[PDB]
């Protein structure tokens, strides 16, 4: 289960595969580059 921050309980445990919370963060951190909605 993904909690939209690159947290995810597997196994019956949550856990942060970090790359993958890392790509959520650019995408939010790279989309405000200047302009480019």
Known sequence: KYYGNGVHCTKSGC???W???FS???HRLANGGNGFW
Do not use: I, L
Request: avoid cysteine; charge should be negative; proline fraction near 0%.
């Open 15 to 17: 856990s942060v595969n």
């Open 19 to 21: 790359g993958e919370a």
């Open 24 to 26: 959520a963060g650019v």
